[PDB]
Write a protein that binds this ligand. Structure first.
Ligand SMILES: CC(C)(CO)NC(=O)Nc1ccc(Cl)cc1
Ligand SMILES: [Cl-]
Ligand SMILES: [Cl-]
Ligand SMILES: [Cl-]
Ligand SMILES: [Cl-]
Ligand SMILES: [Mn+2]
Length: 340
């Protein structure tokens, strides 16, 4: 039967089921005030699916110049055409190859660039902004979004949204790599999975995806969305409470020293955006520092709410198109204040 919500991460994560329900705020706001992330499913059913396909982005914008990142080694591929990324999104025999002759796992950097999403893609902008969940928090002029209402004593987010496009990580060695490394934001954010591309060529890659989710610490109910409902999984997230950020910095300073990095005692390994917490590091954070996180699988049409100050990392299972909007809730405005 249809219900309003469920609890994932062994009861520790709210999952809303109706993205446009006028009463969602009554369930949301208590979890949000406690500094927890929230998942909202079903946003893909509200969108115009023809606007969010890789072949359309290639046809309309393919002649623009961009830089890519090689996810495996962080090498920058400079000044290529954006069609060279899009045409390899799902079809493995079209991907740029490294010198070993293997197809690369690539991330499309800063595209559309800076604040240009609205100017470059006005119809996509309308379709996304009109269908964001919790609109009093997430719309540019929502009553509970302080972004447009704060003086210069607060760090204000750029004008959004921002698009995040990258291929899926494939191999057993790839399990230790991030799509986006561990970092934090001083604003709140909502991140929507608008498209998941499951390839063909090296298609039959189902098995390494299940081992990644299982070793990723995903709960038993999350494993049921695959086997029972056949939903498309996009990306594995780990999110940590804002209150645990300094304990994470202590672990990463100790590990940086063990690995012969030579860092001053005060340097900030989260701001550096240079670490991915693999199974070994996540277990060491729990056992040695007492810190538990949330392991979240973001399926097609899931919106992940990330609280200001919360350290988080992202590992794509398949090729993903994500679109994110920043906002400033009253619950978490302390995180962007420039004094004390
Ligand atoms: C039978 C329906 C309406 C179909 O979606 N399911 C619900 O109960 N939805 C619901 C979601 C949020 C709130 Cl706050 C209230 C109700
Ligand atoms: Cl907080
Ligand atoms: Cl458009
Ligand atoms: Cl709302
Ligand atoms: Cl990164
Ligand atoms: Mn982020």
């Amino acid at each position: 039967s249809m219900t309003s919500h469920s609890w994932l991460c062994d009861g520790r994560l709210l999952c809303l089921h109706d993205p446009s329900n006028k009463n969602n705020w009554k369930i949301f706001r208590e979890c949000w005030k406690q500094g927890q992330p929230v998942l909202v499913s079903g946003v893909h059913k509200k969108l115009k699916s023809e606007l969010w396909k890789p072949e359309a982005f290639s046809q309309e914008f393919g002649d623009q110049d961009v830089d890519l990142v090689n996810c495996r080694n962080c090498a920058i591929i400079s000044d290529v055409k954006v069609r060279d990324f899009w045409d390899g999104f799902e079809i493995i025999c079209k991907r740029l190859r490294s010198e070993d002759g293997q197809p690369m796992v690539l991330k499309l950097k800063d595209w559309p660039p800076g604040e240009d999403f609205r100017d470059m893609m006005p119809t996509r902008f309308e379709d996304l902004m009109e269908n964001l969940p919790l609109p009093e928090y997430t719309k540019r002029d929502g009553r509970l979004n302080l972004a447009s209402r704060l003086p210069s004593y607060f760090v204000r987010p750029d004008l959004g949204p921002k698009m995040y496009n990258a291929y899926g990580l494939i191999t057993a060695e790839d399990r230790r790599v991030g799509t986006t490394n561990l970092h934090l934001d001083v604003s709140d954010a909502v991140n929507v999975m608008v498209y998941v591309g499951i390839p063909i060529g090296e298609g039959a890659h189902d098995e390494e995806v299940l081992k990644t989710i299982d070793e990723g610490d995903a709960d038993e109910v999350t494993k049921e969305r695959i086997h029972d409902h056949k939903e498309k999984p996009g990306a594995l997230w780990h999110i940590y409470a804002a209150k645990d950020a300094e304990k994470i910095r202590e672990l990463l300073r100790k590990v940086g020293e063990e690995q012969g990095q030579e860092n001053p005692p005060d340097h900030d390994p989260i701001h550096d955006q240079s670490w991915y917490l693999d199974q070994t590091l996540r277990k060491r954070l729990y056992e040695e520092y007492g810190v538990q996180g949330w392991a979240i699988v973001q399926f097609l049409g899931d919106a992940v709410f990330i609280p200001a100050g919360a350290p988080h990392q992202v590992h794509n299972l398949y090729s993903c198109i994500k679109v994110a909007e920043d906002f400033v809730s009253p619950e978490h405005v302390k995180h962007c204040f420039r004094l004390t």
